[PDB]
Amino acid sequence: DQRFGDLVFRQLAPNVWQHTSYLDMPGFGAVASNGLIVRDGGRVLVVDTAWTDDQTAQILNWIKQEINLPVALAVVTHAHQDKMGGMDALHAAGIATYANALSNQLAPQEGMVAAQHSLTFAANGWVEPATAPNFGPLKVFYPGPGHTSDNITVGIDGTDIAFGGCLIKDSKAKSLGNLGDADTEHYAASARAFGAAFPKASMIVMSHSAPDSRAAITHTARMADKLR
Ligand SMILES: [O-]
Ligand SMILES: [Zn+2]
Ligand SMILES: [Zn+2]
């Protein structure tokens, strides 16, 4: 771990880092949220903001210090604060932003600023390629409704890594966390669909646990079986 102001950065693979930020959540504690930073040749790609604009500006500062290449785009994985709370900071920095069309639709009512561009998805869940131009190694997949109706996931080509966002919890998790906006009927199938989309991914990264094996996926789905 590298502490950088109030955030934490951890290298996961040669061109991939995890960013972590915290929100002191009244009546629960200081909740960590993770996203990703990927170097693709001469540019950087970001998955998820931090909780806040100030924290997200700090992610960009860290990138400037440790990579020193332009951030070409960011993709955010649903319309909750941990994933989209720093959209204004990305826009202030001139970074092109992307989210599920449904996330952009929901953003205002969720208290988020919408991304500039909307991703749409084929019936099988893969992003429609025209809506994710210049995504390089980022392979975006909509697994179905689970943690939220709009949750999306991202594999990183050239690595063993897939990112489940808030859909997936680690293999020792006691619960499925914040289910306030969850789809209880479809959660288990959506978790399994994420696994099936990225079958070779041996490192599963997620919002609220450290990176884990694929047991994160099986355990999450098995817990979600109890929601039905
Ligand atoms: O979330
Ligand atoms: Zn969420
Ligand atoms: Zn979350």
UniProtKB/Swiss-Prot annotation:
Disulfide bonding pattern of the chain: none
Domain of life per record: Bacteria
A single MF term (Gene Ontology): beta-lactamase activity
Residues reported in the UniProt entry to bind Zn(2+) 2: 82, 166, 208
Location in the cell: Periplasm
Cofactor note as given: Binds 2 Zn(2+) ions per subunit.
GO annotation, cellular component aspect: periplasmic space
Co-factor requirement: Zn(2+)
Annotated residues for binding of Zn(2+) 1: 78, 80, 147
GO biological process, one term: response to antibiotic
Coarse class of the protein's main subcellular location: periplasm
EC number(s) reported in the record: 3.5.2.6
Note: Enterobacteriaceae carrying this gene (identified by PCR) have been isolated in Sweden, India, Pakistan, Bangladesh, England, Scotland, Northern Ireland, Australia and the USA. The organisms they were identified in were K.pneumoniae, Enterobacter cloacae, E.coli, Proteus spp, Citrobacter freundii, Morganella morganii, Providencia spp and Klebsille oxytoca. In India most isolates were from community-acquired infections rather than hospital-acquired infections, indicating the gene is widespread in the environment.
Subunit structure: Monomer.
Family indicated by similarity: Belongs to the metallo-beta-lactamase superfamily. Class-B beta-lactamase family.
Name under which the protein is recorded: Metallo-beta-lactamase type 2
Taxonomic placement: Bacteria, Pseudomonadati, Pseudomonadota, Gammaproteobacteria, Enterobacterales
Shown residues in whole-protein numbering: 43 to 270 of 270
